């Protein structure tokens, strides 16, 4: 396992440096230098905060993958809580961006009130509070074992049924619910774009709408393209748990390697907003 032992820390450190640099730059610029333009920038600020939290918690995972875990049960619980909060916050702030764009484009006459309220007093309730509440199993279950040699910092459910239940609800919520909301919103938006001669009532409003809309499409596509293979891997694993999939013992180790490598590569979602700012900031 030398290949994995050398591969994991390098990726966890590259992502860590890039996340610190990009997310710190974005947060400083849009929090103190006042470069915020519209509601999409507020949503991207919230995304940057969540990604900064996860990037801060990454080095502990790097050290854990290198040799061992010398940090403690409290730090194990903290890193698990931070990871879950970041995941559920980002995957749904994306859906809030999609809803904002749908309201802006489809109903362009009187969207100011349900475009201002939905971001000024509803984003917290819709994103952070369910994200905080979903971390109660992290408090209950996240622990540090004392197996031979190494110390393991993972979640130890009493029985495998809860393992499959938690995997299914994670997949369900964080891939399907924003997935369906984004599908509906962007299908309607794209159907509007290809048909309406002139959105709103002036050419400048039309071009502003298109220019604001496109980066969010690119961001959502990149996010889902990064996160999808990990979900495929854990879906195959869960179907291995339930007595459906059964092949030779080589399949188990192949799936373990696939899921580990793909999670390492899917942690790249934290570096998307700074990259899009770099691409579209000339």
């Amino acid at each position, epitope marked *: 396992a030398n290949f994995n032992k050398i591969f994991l820390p390098t990726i966890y450190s590259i992502i860590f440096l890039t996340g610190i640099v990009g997310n710190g730059l974005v947060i400083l610029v849009m929090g103190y230098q006042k470069k915020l333009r519209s509601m999409t920038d507020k949503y991207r600020l919230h995304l940057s905060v969540a990604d900064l939290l996860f990037v801060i918690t990454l080095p502990f995972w790097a050290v854990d993958a290198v040799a061992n875990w010398y940090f403690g049960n409290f730090l194990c619980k903290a890193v698990h809580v931070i990871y879950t909060v970041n995941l559920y916050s980002s995957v749904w702030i994306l859906a809030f961006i999609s809803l904002d764009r749908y309201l802006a484009i489809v109903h362009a006459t009187n969207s100011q009130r349900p475009r201002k309220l939905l971001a000024e007093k509803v984003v917290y309730v819709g994103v952070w509070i369910p994200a905080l509440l979903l971390t109660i199993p992290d408090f209950i279950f996240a622990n540090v074992s004392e197996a031979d040699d190494r110390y393991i910092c993972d979640r130890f459910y009493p029985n495998d049924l809860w393992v499959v239940v938690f995997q299914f609800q994670h997949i369900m919520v964080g891939l399907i619910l924003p997935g369906i909301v984004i599908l509906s919103c962007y299908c309607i938006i794209i159907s509007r*774009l*290809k048909s309406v001669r*002139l959105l709103s009532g002036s050419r400048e409003k*039309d*071009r502003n709408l*298109r220019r604001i*809309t496109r980066p969010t499409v690119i961001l959502i596509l990149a996010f889902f393209a990064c996160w999808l293979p990990y979900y495929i891997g854990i879906s195959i694993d869960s179907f291995i748990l339930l007595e459906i999939i059964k092949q030779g013992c080589e399949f188990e180790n192949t799936v373990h390697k696939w899921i580990s490598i793909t999670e390492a590569l899917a942690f790249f979602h934290c570096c998307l907003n700074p990259i899009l700012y770099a691409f579209l900031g000339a």
Partner: nanobody
Amino acid sequence: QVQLQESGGGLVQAGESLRLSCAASGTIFRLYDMGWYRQRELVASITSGGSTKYGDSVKGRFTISRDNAKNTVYLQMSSLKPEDTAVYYCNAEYRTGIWEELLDGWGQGTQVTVSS
């Protein structure tokens, strides 16, 4: 970009029938409005939905048409008058992409002369 041309002009006797043409080809994502002008005197313009907006001086006089397959617009002329001897400019509104703004266009021009 896109290319638009005009044709159908020449020396024609009064009271004859002809059909002007204006074909657009190239990086076309969608054509929205296509019309003929004569400043900018709106004499005919057919939307993609067929809701034509004829001019006041040609009310009940000119007939317009459009072939979405060939991206062409046809102007059916009939009952020529000496006051109608002018040069017509093909005008069209197009778009080069989903995220691109509305781009206007113009044609080279066609001259129609009435014998006298």
